[PDB]
With several copies, the nearest count.
Chain A
Amino acid sequence: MLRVYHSNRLDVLEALMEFIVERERLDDPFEPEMILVQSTGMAQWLQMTLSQKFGIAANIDFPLPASFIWDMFVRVLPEIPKESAFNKQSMSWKLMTLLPQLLEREDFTLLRHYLTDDSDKRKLFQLSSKAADLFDQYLVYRPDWLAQWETGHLVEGLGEAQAWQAPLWKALVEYTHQLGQPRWHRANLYQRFIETLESATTCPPGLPSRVFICGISALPPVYLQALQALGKHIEIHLLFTNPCRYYWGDIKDPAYLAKLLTRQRRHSFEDRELPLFRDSENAGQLFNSDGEQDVGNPLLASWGKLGRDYIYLLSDLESSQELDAFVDVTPDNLLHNIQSDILELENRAVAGVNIEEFSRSDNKRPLDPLDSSI
């Protein structure tokens, strides 16, 4: 049970937040309301609109998604420390000590030539900081490589520099075991979390009743899987603001798009999906290997790469409840014409492929010469 609210503007999604929190209400007054954001301006705007409608908007928490996931980790699973031992600076300070001892090992000749010029610790500090940043990015995005490097294997099909990154990680793990700090971290914690959450009772202790996600268009697949697992027992709402109306994603397999016939529900009435349910499905609208080549608007096709990735990620869940609430716009100005052409996913560019349409120039849309939109 993971409701996803597709829309076009942010005023509509704002009305959906105010309708839900008014229809039901929390029992205990000291229980906060959790809203996930990414910056501060969105939090300020949300507080302003909520307070303007209600009268006051107080005791609302705005944590980062990573901090929310770690809080759910320490709440559900036991004996976890409140903060991880693998911070963004702790790895840098540990590799500062680790690198001189790890040097002279027949695989670190590049680092030896980089380091043994002179030593005011500046080059070592910069190298340690960059290595810590890279390992943090690995921990967030791809944990399988770290899982293999814990044992000491090597993965095939990957480029160079693995021969100096993997023993560095193994020695760092051994060092942080030698100190005595806690062992648990985000690469080997999430699998045990989802395993102990998927098959359990329906009443875990300490979890909140509901949580909203507003103004987020970037989520890793690991966090998406964790949120899908957590949404089975508590009610979670997802707000995604996509410009297009129909499905504008990619494809994986000649039978995957047959599975893509999931049913989007209108917010009150019935079901909608992209038109031409089988000819546009199997035909050249979707390409054989990659995504759509005849996307529609060239502006959308050239600018919405991240949106395509995000809608491809959210178009793959199994327990979600995909419902939409859109609003139409009328073409009267230049800006409204462009927005309507983007939303409807249609092409309105004159190329001039043949002599007759190249000669006649009375098929475009007329423009008011007193317009001042763009």
Chain B
Amino acid sequence: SNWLGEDSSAYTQQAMAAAMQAHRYDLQYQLYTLALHRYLRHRIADYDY
């Protein structure tokens, strides 16, 4: 949940892509995927990404 997008046109695939780089949320991608991969390699035997 975030800022007051008073019009529905302020939540399109370009506005969110701009806000992704403007708030640097792209690090969470790799960090969370690595964290979940390191857990799957311990839980599931014969795991393929």
Contacts and interface: CB of A to CB of B under 8 A. Distances in A.
Nearest to B37: A56
B44 interface: yes
B42 interface: yes
Interface in A22-75: 25-26, 29, 54-56, 58-59
B19 interface: no
**Most interface-central of A25, A54, A56, A59 (chain B CB within 10 A):** A56
A56 B44 contact: no
Contacts of A59: 39
B38 interface: yes
Bin the interface of chain A by size. under 10
Interface in A60-99: none
Interface in A285-313: none
B32 to A, nearest CB: 11
Nearest to A59: B39
Contacts of B40: 29
Contacts of B45: 25
A280 to B, nearest CB: 49
Nearest to B44: A29
A308 to B, nearest CB: 41
Contacts of A56: 35, 38-39, 42
Nearest to A26: B43
Nearest to B43: A29
Nearest to B36: A58
Closest 10 CB pairs of A and B: A29-B43, A56-B38, A58-B39, A56-B39, A55-B38, A29-B44, A54-B42, A56-B35, A56-B42, A55-B42
17 contacts: A25-B43, A25-B45, A26-B43, A29-B40, A29-B43, A29-B44, A54-B42, A55-B38, A55-B41, A55-B42, A56-B35, A56-B38, A56-B39, A56-B42, A58-B35, A58-B39, A59-B39
